[PDB]
Design an enzyme around this catalytic site. Structure first.
Site, PDB file in Angstrom:
ATOM      1  N   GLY B   9       0.619  -1.155   0.023  1.00  0.00           N
ATOM      2  CA  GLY B   9      -0.123   0.007   0.172  1.00  0.00           C
ATOM      3  C   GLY B   9       0.994   1.338  -0.099  1.00  0.00           C
ATOM      4  O   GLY B   9       0.336   2.352  -0.365  1.00  0.00           O
ATOM      5  N   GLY B  11       3.721   1.634  -1.603  1.00  0.00           N
ATOM      6  CA  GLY B  11       4.494   1.746  -3.201  1.00  0.00           C
ATOM      7  C   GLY B  11       3.802   2.774  -3.954  1.00  0.00           C
ATOM      8  O   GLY B  11       2.856   3.324  -3.564  1.00  0.00           O
ATOM      9  N   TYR B 134      13.368 -13.649 -10.229  1.00  0.00           N
ATOM     10  CA  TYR B 134      11.971 -12.685 -10.124  1.00  0.00           C
ATOM     11  C   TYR B 134      10.720 -13.063 -11.017  1.00  0.00           C
ATOM     12  O   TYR B 134       9.692 -12.858 -10.761  1.00  0.00           O
ATOM     13  CB  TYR B 134      12.436 -10.960 -10.205  1.00  0.00           C
ATOM     14  CG  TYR B 134      10.994 -10.262 -10.424  1.00  0.00           C
ATOM     15  CD1 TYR B 134      10.642  -9.936 -11.678  1.00  0.00           C
ATOM     16  CD2 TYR B 134      10.602  -9.701  -9.034  1.00  0.00           C
ATOM     17  CE1 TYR B 134       9.681  -8.771 -11.713  1.00  0.00           C
ATOM     18  CE2 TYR B 134       9.411  -8.824  -9.368  1.00  0.00           C
ATOM     19  CZ  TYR B 134       8.938  -8.438 -10.373  1.00  0.00           C
ATOM     20  OH  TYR B 134       7.804  -7.541 -10.681  1.00  0.00           O
ATOM     21  N   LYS B 138       6.828 -14.310 -10.337  1.00  0.00           N
ATOM     22  CA  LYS B 138       5.652 -13.679 -10.664  1.00  0.00           C
ATOM     23  C   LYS B 138       5.032 -14.562 -11.468  1.00  0.00           C
ATOM     24  O   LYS B 138       3.531 -14.500 -11.271  1.00  0.00           O
ATOM     25  CB  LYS B 138       6.206 -12.507 -11.581  1.00  0.00           C
ATOM     26  CG  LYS B 138       6.342 -11.069 -10.747  1.00  0.00           C
ATOM     27  CD  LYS B 138       5.607 -10.604  -9.763  1.00  0.00           C
ATOM     28  CE  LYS B 138       5.783  -9.326  -9.403  1.00  0.00           C
ATOM     29  NZ  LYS B 138       4.679  -8.899  -8.515  1.00  0.00           N
ATOM     30  N   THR B 162       1.605  -2.164 -17.934  1.00  0.00           N
ATOM     31  CA  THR B 162       3.073  -1.904 -18.508  1.00  0.00           C
ATOM     32  C   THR B 162       3.758  -1.046 -17.721  1.00  0.00           C
ATOM     33  O   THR B 162       3.807  -1.115 -16.567  1.00  0.00           O
ATOM     34  CB  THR B 162       2.680  -1.382 -20.066  1.00  0.00           C
ATOM     35  OG1 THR B 162       1.565  -0.174 -19.894  1.00  0.00           O
ATOM     36  CG2 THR B 162       1.828  -2.305 -21.127  1.00  0.00           C
ATOM     37  N   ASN B 163       4.639  -0.354 -18.163  1.00  0.00           N
ATOM     38  CA  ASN B 163       5.489   0.762 -17.482  1.00  0.00           C
ATOM     39  C   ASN B 163       4.831   1.708 -16.679  1.00  0.00           C
ATOM     40  O   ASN B 163       4.582   2.744 -17.229  1.00  0.00           O
ATOM     41  CB  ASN B 163       6.751   1.336 -18.267  1.00  0.00           C
ATOM     42  CG  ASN B 163       7.921   1.439 -17.321  1.00  0.00           C
ATOM     43  OD1 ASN B 163       8.937   0.927 -17.535  1.00  0.00           O
ATOM     44  ND2 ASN B 163       7.592   2.340 -16.318  1.00  0.00           N
ATOM     45  N   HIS B 177      14.683   2.606 -12.979  1.00  0.00           N
ATOM     46  CA  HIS B 177      13.624   3.096 -13.611  1.00  0.00           C
ATOM     47  C   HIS B 177      13.481   4.114 -14.398  1.00  0.00           C
ATOM     48  O   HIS B 177      13.751   5.265 -14.175  1.00  0.00           O
ATOM     49  CB  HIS B 177      12.429   3.343 -12.656  1.00  0.00           C
ATOM     50  CG  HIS B 177      12.076   2.014 -11.766  1.00  0.00           C
ATOM     51  ND1 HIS B 177      12.849   1.474 -10.796  1.00  0.00           N
ATOM     52  CD2 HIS B 177      10.925   1.261 -11.448  1.00  0.00           C
ATOM     53  CE1 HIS B 177      12.531   0.234 -10.381  1.00  0.00           C
ATOM     54  NE2 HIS B 177      11.074   0.262 -10.693  1.00  0.00           N
ATOM     55  N   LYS B 185      17.095  12.973 -13.041  1.00  0.00           N
ATOM     56  CA  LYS B 185      18.399  13.343 -13.896  1.00  0.00           C
ATOM     57  C   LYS B 185      18.024  14.830 -14.072  1.00  0.00           C
ATOM     58  O   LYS B 185      19.180  15.617 -14.043  1.00  0.00           O
ATOM     59  CB  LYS B 185      18.619  12.754 -15.021  1.00  0.00           C
ATOM     60  CG  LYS B 185      19.589  11.517 -14.793  1.00  0.00           C
ATOM     61  CD  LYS B 185      20.275  10.783 -15.963  1.00  0.00           C
ATOM     62  CE  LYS B 185      19.204   9.597 -16.263  1.00  0.00           C
ATOM     63  NZ  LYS B 185      17.924   9.966 -16.293  1.00  0.00           N
ATOM     64  N   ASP B 266      19.692  -0.159 -23.203  1.00  0.00           N
ATOM     65  CA  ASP B 266      18.891   0.153 -24.301  1.00  0.00           C
ATOM     66  C   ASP B 266      17.479  -0.538 -24.042  1.00  0.00           C
ATOM     67  O   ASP B 266      17.055  -0.613 -22.977  1.00  0.00           O
ATOM     68  CB  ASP B 266      19.446  -0.141 -25.767  1.00  0.00           C
ATOM     69  CG  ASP B 266      19.644   1.064 -26.597  1.00  0.00           C
ATOM     70  OD1 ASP B 266      20.354   0.938 -27.514  1.00  0.00           O
ATOM     71  OD2 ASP B 266      18.838   2.080 -26.303  1.00  0.00           O
TER      72      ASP B 266
HETATM   73  N1  NDP Z   1       6.008  -0.230 -13.506  1.00  0.00           N
HETATM   74  C1  NDP Z   1       5.777  -0.742 -12.537  1.00  0.00           C
HETATM   75  O1  NDP Z   1       6.099  -0.204 -11.580  1.00  0.00           O
HETATM   76  C2  NDP Z   1       5.122  -2.315 -12.612  1.00  0.00           C
HETATM   77  C3  NDP Z   1       4.881  -3.151 -11.491  1.00  0.00           C
HETATM   78  N2  NDP Z   1       4.389  -4.112 -11.407  1.00  0.00           N
HETATM   79  C4  NDP Z   1       3.942  -4.792 -10.199  1.00  0.00           C
HETATM   80  O2  NDP Z   1       2.975  -3.891  -9.554  1.00  0.00           O
HETATM   81  C5  NDP Z   1       3.513  -3.975  -8.176  1.00  0.00           C
HETATM   82  C6  NDP Z   1       3.454  -2.524  -7.925  1.00  0.00           C
HETATM   83  O3  NDP Z   1       4.883  -1.991  -7.728  1.00  0.00           O
HETATM   84  P1  NDP Z   1       5.151  -0.627  -6.956  1.00  0.00           P
HETATM   85  O4  NDP Z   1       4.195  -0.269  -6.157  1.00  0.00           O
HETATM   86  O5  NDP Z   1       5.567   0.154  -8.338  1.00  0.00           O
HETATM   87  O6  NDP Z   1       6.475  -0.998  -6.113  1.00  0.00           O
HETATM   88  P2  NDP Z   1       7.046  -0.420  -5.195  1.00  0.00           P
HETATM   89  O7  NDP Z   1       8.598  -0.500  -4.853  1.00  0.00           O
HETATM   90  O8  NDP Z   1       6.841   1.088  -4.989  1.00  0.00           O
HETATM   91  O9  NDP Z   1       6.307  -0.872  -4.019  1.00  0.00           O
HETATM   92  C7  NDP Z   1       6.585  -1.846  -3.013  1.00  0.00           C
HETATM   93  C8  NDP Z   1       5.684  -2.139  -1.872  1.00  0.00           C
HETATM   94  O10 NDP Z   1       5.834  -3.533  -1.595  1.00  0.00           O
HETATM   95  C9  NDP Z   1       6.105  -3.619   0.088  1.00  0.00           C
HETATM   96  N3  NDP Z   1       6.925  -4.775   0.175  1.00  0.00           N
HETATM   97  C10 NDP Z   1       8.062  -4.831  -0.071  1.00  0.00           C
HETATM   98  N4  NDP Z   1       8.547  -6.203   0.677  1.00  0.00           N
HETATM   99  C11 NDP Z   1       7.748  -6.449   1.227  1.00  0.00           C
HETATM  100  C12 NDP Z   1       7.612  -7.315   2.440  1.00  0.00           C
HETATM  101  N5  NDP Z   1       8.673  -8.222   2.644  1.00  0.00           N
HETATM  102  N6  NDP Z   1       6.284  -7.372   3.298  1.00  0.00           N
HETATM  103  C13 NDP Z   1       5.204  -6.610   2.752  1.00  0.00           C
HETATM  104  N7  NDP Z   1       5.504  -5.572   2.072  1.00  0.00           N
HETATM  105  C14 NDP Z   1       6.686  -5.282   1.233  1.00  0.00           C
HETATM  106  C15 NDP Z   1       6.603  -2.247   0.139  1.00  0.00           C
HETATM  107  O11 NDP Z   1       6.305  -1.711   1.496  1.00  0.00           O
HETATM  108  P3  NDP Z   1       7.410  -0.977   2.313  1.00  0.00           P
HETATM  109  O12 NDP Z   1       7.661   0.262   1.927  1.00  0.00           O
HETATM  110  O13 NDP Z   1       7.104  -1.296   3.715  1.00  0.00           O
HETATM  111  O14 NDP Z   1       8.561  -1.783   1.806  1.00  0.00           O
HETATM  112  C16 NDP Z   1       5.838  -1.450  -0.736  1.00  0.00           C
HETATM  113  O15 NDP Z   1       4.758  -1.133  -0.200  1.00  0.00           O
HETATM  114  C17 NDP Z   1       4.620  -4.528  -7.915  1.00  0.00           C
HETATM  115  O16 NDP Z   1       4.465  -5.805  -7.443  1.00  0.00           O
HETATM  116  C18 NDP Z   1       5.230  -4.809  -9.417  1.00  0.00           C
HETATM  117  O17 NDP Z   1       5.885  -6.149  -9.498  1.00  0.00           O
HETATM  118  C19 NDP Z   1       3.983  -4.572 -12.475  1.00  0.00           C
HETATM  119  C20 NDP Z   1       3.878  -3.833 -13.720  1.00  0.00           C
HETATM  120  C21 NDP Z   1       4.669  -2.794 -14.069  1.00  0.00           C
END
Ligand code: NDP
Ligand code: NDP
Lengths: 307, 309
Positions: B9, B11, B134, B138, B162-163, B177, B185, B266
Site C-alpha cells: 500500500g 508503493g 523474479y 511472478k 505496462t510501465n 526505472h 536526472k 537500451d
Molecule cells: N511499472 C511498474 O512499476 C510495474 C509494477 N508491477 C508490479 O506492480 C506492483 C507495484 O509495484 P510498485 O508499487 O511500483 O513498487 P514499490 O516498490 O513502490 O512497492 C513496493 C511495496 O511492496 C512492499 N513490500 C516490499 N517487501 C515487502 C515485504 N517483505 N512485506 C510487505 N511488504 C513489502 C513495500 O512496502 P515497504 O515500503 O514497507 O517496503 C511497498 O509497499 C509490483 O508488485 C510490481 O511487481 C507490474 C508492472 C509494472
C-alpha cells in the site's frame, strides 16, 4: 569422507538405491522417508538437516500419486511440492551441502514440443494442463538450482528419469502407473478368469527404465557429473515399447495364458545422448528380464506391496 | 459488507489507489504494507490476515528494487517473492476471501516472442535470463491462481500493467526505472550545469500513469471475474520512445541545457495488447502522456526531500 542424505528413501527409487549392496562403497548413507521428517514442514526439515549433517543430498521426496487419478488437486500438487523442494534445497544450502541432486519427470516438458525432447527444452512452453501444478513445481526445481548457482556458485542438479518401474512400485491399479498396473491385473486375472487390458489402444509408446538401473546411474550422477543443467536418465530413443508390447512382456513373465483384449501421449520420446556422452559403455537390463524380475518380486511380496 | 486489504500500500501503485479521496466508495479500504508485516513470514502474514478479515485483496507487495542493478541475486528474488505470494494467496484463501488480484509485469514474458504480447503468452517460453528468479516467481502467481480456481472454484486473478510511473515512484538513478530516472536526472541537471539519458533513445515503451492504473484496479476488483489475467495498458497505437519521454520531461521541467550516451543498456520493444480492456471498457480514457509527466515532475519537485531518490 562424505555423508549422503536420501529423501524419499522408502519409495520406488529410494528402495532401489538402498542397494548399494552389492555395495555403493567408500561414504555414510542416510535414508529417510517420512514422517521421520515431513519435508512439508520447514521446522522439521531444518531440524533433520541439523541432526544428520549431509555433505551430499539425493532428493527423491515428492507429493505424487493421485497424479494419474482423474480427480485432480492442482493446488495440492503445487503447494506441497514447492514447500518440500524449497525446504530441502535451502536446508541443504544452510548446512553447507556440497551437492544436491533432485528428480524431475519427462511429463513436465512442454505439451507441444518436437521429439525427441532433450535437457534444454524443459521451459520452452507450458506443460500439459492435466497436472500443471505438479509440472510447474518440478520445473521450479531447475529454477532453484540455477539460482543457487548464479548467486553462490553452488552445484545443485537434477536427473530426469523416463518411466521408472521395478520392485516397491505402486501396484494399485486405480492410480494408474501402467506397468505395475499390468502386473497386478495379470495377477488378479490368473486367480480368476478372462481379463485385460488396462484399456486403450495399446499403441502408445514409452521409455521404461528399471529402478535398479536408475539406482546405478543416480549414484554415478552423485559421485561425478557437475552440470546444473539436468540429465535425462533413460534407455535409447529407439528402445521404447508400446503398451501392447509391455502387456506381452508381463503376460509372458507371469505365465498367464488367458485372453488379453483392449479398447494418452501418444509418446513422449526423450533423448539420452548426454548420458551417452558420459557413459557409452553402460548397459541397461533388458526390458523383458527387468519385467520378469519385478513380476517375481510382486508375486513373492504381494502382502507387503503397495496395493 | 466488503473489507479490502492492500499489500504494498505504500508503493507507487498503492499510494495511487489511496485516492479513493477523491472517492472509491460503496466498502472499507485497509491499506497496509509497509512491512509493518513482513509478508515473507507465514506467521506474521497469517496474524495480519486473521486480524483484518478481508473479503478482497489487492496484492501489490513484492520484492523489487535492486532488480535493475548490475549484480544479480536470483535466489533471493525467487525465494522471497515465492514466499510472499504463497503467504498472501493462501492466508487469503484461509480467511475465506471472495477475490484476490495480483500484479504481473510484462518483464516476465518470454524473451523470444511475437508482438504484441497478450494474456495467453505468459508461459510460452523462458523469460530473459537476467532476472529469471523474479520472473518465474511472478509467473507462478498465475499458476497459483489457476490452482485455487481448479481445485476450489475461487476467483484469484492478476492484472498486467505496462510501465507504471507517477508520484511516489522509485526516483533512484541506480535502480534504473527509466521515467523516474529522467525526472531525477533533469533535476540534478538544473541544480548545476547539464544527460544521458542512457542509450540511443530509440527503444519504445508503453507507460501508464499510476492514477489511471489505480482506477482500473478498483474496477477490476469490483468487476472482472476471469482467472486469466488482464493487461492494463494504453494502446499499441500509442507508445513513446525514450527520446519522446525525455522531451516531455524536459518541457515539463523547463530545462534549457541533451546527448544520449550510446554505450548504455537500451528491447527495443515490449508491446502489449489492450484488446481485453478495450472489450470491457471501450470508453475508458487514460490521462495524456505529456500532462501526466508534468504532474509527476511537479510532485517530484514539491516533494524532493521526502522522495525515494
Ligand atoms: N511499472 C511498474 O512499476 C510495474 C509494477 N508491477 C508490479 O506492480 C506492483 C507495484 O509495484 P510498485 O508499487 O511500483 O513498487 P514499490 O516498490 O513502490 O512497492 C513496493 C511495496 O511492496 C512492499 N513490500 C516490499 N517487501 C515487502 C515485504 N517483505 N512485506 C510487505 N511488504 C513489502 C513495500 O512496502 P515497504 O515500503 O514497507 O517496503 C511497498 O509497499 C509490483 O508488485 C510490481 O511487481 C507490474 C508492472 C509494472
Ligand atoms: N516413478 C516414476 O515413474 C518417476 C518418478 N520420478 C521422480 O522420482 C522421485 C521418486 O519417485 P518414486 O520413487 O517413484 O515415488 P514413490 O511415491 O514411490 O516414493 C515417494 C517418496 O516420497 C516420500 N514423501 C512423500 N511425501 C513426503 C513428505 N511430506 N515428507 C517426506 N517424504 C515424503 C515418500 O515417503 P513416505 O513413504 O514416507 O511417504 C516416499 O519415500 C519422485 O520425486 C518422482 O517425481 C521421476 C520420473 C519418473
Amino acid at each position: 569422507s562424505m555423508r549422503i542424505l536420501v529423501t524419499g528413501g522408502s519409495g520406488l527409487v529410494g528402495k532401489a538405491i538402498q542397494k548399494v549392496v552389492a555395495d555403493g562403497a567408500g561414504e555414510d548413507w542416510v535414508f529417510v522417508s517420512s514422517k521421520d521428517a515431513d519435508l512439508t514442514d520447514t521446522a522439521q526439515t531444518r531440524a533433520l538437516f541439523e541432526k544428520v549433517q549431509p555433505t551430499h543430498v539425493i532428493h527423491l521426496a515428492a507429493m505424487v500419486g493421485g497424479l494419474f487419478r482423474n480427480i485432480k488437486y492442482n493446488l495440492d500438487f503445487w503447494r506441497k511440492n514447492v514447500h518440500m523442494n524449497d525446504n530441502v534445497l535451502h536446508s541443504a544450502f544452510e548446512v553447507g551441502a556440497r551437492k544436491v541432486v533432485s528428480c524431475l519427470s519427462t511429463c513436465i516438458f512442454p505439451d507441444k514440443t518436437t521429439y525427441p525432447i532433450d535437457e534444454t527444452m524443459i521451459h520452452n512452453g507450458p506443460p500439459h494442463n492435466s497436472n500443471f501444478g505438479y509440472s510447474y513445481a518440478k520445473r521450479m526445481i531447475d529454477v532453484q538450482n540455477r539460482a543457487y548457482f548464479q548467486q553462490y556458485g553452488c552445484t545443485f542438479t537434477a536427473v530426469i528419469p523416463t518411466n521408472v518401474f521395478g520392485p516397491h512400485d505402486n501396484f494399485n491399479i486405480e492410480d494408474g502407473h501402467v506397468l505395475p498396473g499390468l502386473i497386478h491385473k495379470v495377477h488378479l486375472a490368473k486367480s480368476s478368469g478372462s481379463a485385460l487390458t488396462v484399456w486403450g489402444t495399446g499403441n502408445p509408446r514409452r521409455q521404461f527404465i528399471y529402478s535398479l538401473d536408475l539406482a546405478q546411474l543416480f549414484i554415478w550422477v552423485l559421485r561425478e557429473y557437475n552440470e546444473v543443467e539436468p540429465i535425462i536418465l533413460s534407455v535409447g530413443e529407439e528402445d521404447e515399447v508400446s503398451i501392447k508390447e509391455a502387456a506381452e512382456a508381463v503376460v509372458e513373465a507371469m505365465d498367464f495364458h488367458g485372453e488379453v483384449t483392449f479398447d494418452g501421449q501418444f509418446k513422449k520420446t526423450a533423448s539420452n545422448s548426454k548420458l551417452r556422452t558420459y557413459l557409452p559403455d553402460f548397459r541397461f537390463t533388458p526390458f523383458k528380464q527387468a519385467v520378469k524380475e519385478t513380476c517375481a518380486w510382486f508375486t513373492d511380496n504381494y502382502e507387503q506391496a503397495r496395493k
